[PDB]
Design a protein around this ligand. Sequence first.
Ligand SMILES: Cc1ncc(COP(=O)(O)O)c(CN[C@@H](CCC[C@H](N)C(=O)O)C(=O)O)c1O
Ligand SMILES: Cc1ncc(COP(=O)(O)O)c(CN[C@@H](CCC[C@H](N)C(=O)O)C(=O)O)c1O
Lengths: 410, 411
Amino acid sequence: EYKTKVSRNSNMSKLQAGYLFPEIARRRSAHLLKYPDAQVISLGIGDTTEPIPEVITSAMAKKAHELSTIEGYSGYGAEQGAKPLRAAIAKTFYGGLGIGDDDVFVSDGAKCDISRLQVMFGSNVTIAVQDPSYPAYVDSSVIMGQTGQFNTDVQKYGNIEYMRCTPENGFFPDLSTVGRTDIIFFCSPNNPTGAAATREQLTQLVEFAKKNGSIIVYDSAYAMYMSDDNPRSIFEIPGAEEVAMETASFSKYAGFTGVRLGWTVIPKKLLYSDGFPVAKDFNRIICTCFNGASNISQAGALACLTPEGLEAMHKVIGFYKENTNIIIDTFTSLGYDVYGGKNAPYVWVHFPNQSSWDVFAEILEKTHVVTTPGSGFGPGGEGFVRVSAFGHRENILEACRRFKQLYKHH
Amino acid sequence: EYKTKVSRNSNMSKLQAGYLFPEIARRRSAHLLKYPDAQVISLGIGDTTEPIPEVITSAMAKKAHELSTIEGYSGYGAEQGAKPLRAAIAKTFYGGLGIGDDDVFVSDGAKCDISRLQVMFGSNVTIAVQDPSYPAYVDSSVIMGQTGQFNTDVQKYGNIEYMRCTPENGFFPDLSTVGRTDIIFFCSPNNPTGAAATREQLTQLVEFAKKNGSIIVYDSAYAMYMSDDNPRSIFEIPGAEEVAMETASFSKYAGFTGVRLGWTVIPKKLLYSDGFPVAKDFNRIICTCFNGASNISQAGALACLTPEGLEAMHKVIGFYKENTNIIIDTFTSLGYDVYGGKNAPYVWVHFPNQSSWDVFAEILEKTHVVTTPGSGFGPGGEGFVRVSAFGHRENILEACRRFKQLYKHHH
Ligand SMILES: Cc1ncc(COP(=O)(O)O)c(CN[C@@H](CCC[C@H](N)C(=O)O)C(=O)O)c1O
Ligand SMILES: Cc1ncc(COP(=O)(O)O)c(CN[C@@H](CCC[C@H](N)C(=O)O)C(=O)O)c1O
């Protein structure tokens, strides 16, 4: 066979396996081949299941109709997003925190912003991540050339600072033990653990970044699931504007997982070591590497940020939070150490003395319920399984009765 | 003031100025501050202006409505795109060319695919580009670390092979003089010259890539504007499947510039030097760095690829092609050397002995019409101005009457 003379990107060669979530989808497919008549329930991939509120879909259909009229048609938008949407996001989520409309960058979702940030930072930065955390932070770091090879002894890529988050430290890094890096990816409420950092912990985080001269990339994708009285934005911490940016999404708020709309906030006072503002480089990336979020998606997001939209999102979130309660009560009743599930739609269940991939396979095999193994989120996730609360109510209730059946003699 | 100790990305520092198009938007905005009541006509940024056909928007509205129902709701889609959409693209544009549904990757547009392909290729590849060409190829290359610094004597970034495309060579480079690179970005019909490569020229291109072991990234964004009997896809050339991928978009076909939907095709027979299939690496990039095109945009794209959708797109394209003739006739009547506008919605006008930035500035100041300076597309664009044909008919006519009034007593 003919082959080109182009070398494969050696950073792609570093990746130890495929992306976690497509692999979960594939195991579930293999399970259906083995058990063709199984009624599979997915509590694995964190994918919204309830319809989008009518107030929000109406706005999107209205925008679609407008695009077929002379007066309503619009072509390219500013890559940073429509000014009224940037203004609505700035006021609704960061009002009083010193964020202007021009600090807000509208994206087609937080996953894409993470990779665009990584392009901006480039191959020469070192990163820290929570261990465990959402696998896109690590995988994007490897792809950008920020890492060494994968070490199978410790299940870690070289040159990444994995900050262990455990029951024994309250799922917050012991920062006095964390080495200095350029970037710190920090998700709160955390995926997979569900842990939301307190005001005091986030204060420690900002102070740590300030003394180390690091940039925090704060992922607030689940902030609106907060029940405890903890900050929802890193910008609630005085000083955060000198060291932090924030990335968020409508995915888990309005069910926009397939619609695609998020944003990133980069404050004016965030500067590189030579004094150059980080936001100006991000702006170059988004003007060169992106052509803006869909105009229909932006219209839907604008409708979210109204009294009626906010009420609708609250009801959606509240529904998934009640699912979470059902799951937590189930595992606690079965005698498990169960974590998260208070400030997040994920429950983090401790399966000590077992490998999480084995627990995943056992649950799927015996109950036909898909979960997510903790080790897919890094080596600190080993011994845990993440259970997602996104599902129809009857599906959650049925999943929990299957768990009860399975685990009654444990 | 506090600064972090994080070093700025040295690839970002390399960039000579801002991205071209926002700079044009800024000039337009500054002009409107100077003259708030100017009736500005924009023929600069190539942006569609006519409404999206009803058959297509009705489909998008239907999908939006379905998302509010238990049965119609869907969440995350496969990052590669809905299977029926991939199949529709594969059959409609590549039927008979040996492209499968699994070779097609649906994106939120061609600009975004260019940068995801560049992440995939990485910093260790060298590239060739047409000179002039759409500036995203060069700028994404600089961002990814594939280049040296900007040389202001020649107006080029180091380590990029700029392939000279001129009136004299028929806007196709002399491949005997082009150095070997890993990647060759090739746009046909080309932006900004409007030049469409012939079957003979694309055959030379494929043979050149095969002998050099290069990958062609073929941008066919304007292929449906073709009037001459030239290939619309690189895969029409036998052997392309071993050396080429293709990127395209609904932006200029259905007016989806704001809606956001395109695709990339990477064939099974495209392999790196170690035998590894390029498509498998692209698939990892799109699964890691992307979460799929909008479900509503995909529903719109699906409705485009039906008899009614194709008819509607053909009609819109034909409208913009008539605009292009009006613009060509205007500049040829004023005595300019004028290129393009046959196979593309751009007219490429030679202004000898003047900088294109100065011509841009003069046209905007005197006529309140926005154009694009050719030097924004690379050094081979110096001395030319690009004029876009996208616009309401009355605006195109009015712009041309302003050009004639400005230039008739001098030219
Ligand atoms: C901490 C965090 N940050 C960002 C995201 C992505 O947000 P986005 O929808 O791109 O605006 C998510 C959603 N992750 C879920 C869905 C995963 C499967 C999806 N295909 C993906 O690759 O994100 C999960 O962990 O099961 C997240 O949890
Ligand atoms: C040769 C070629 N390839 C790809 C594209 C982008 O396609 P996409 O809409 O992302 O699917 C274009 C559109 N470029 C236009 C609009 C520019 C301004 C837009 N903000 C941008 O940055 O593309 C122009 O040259 O004036 C193109 O010409």
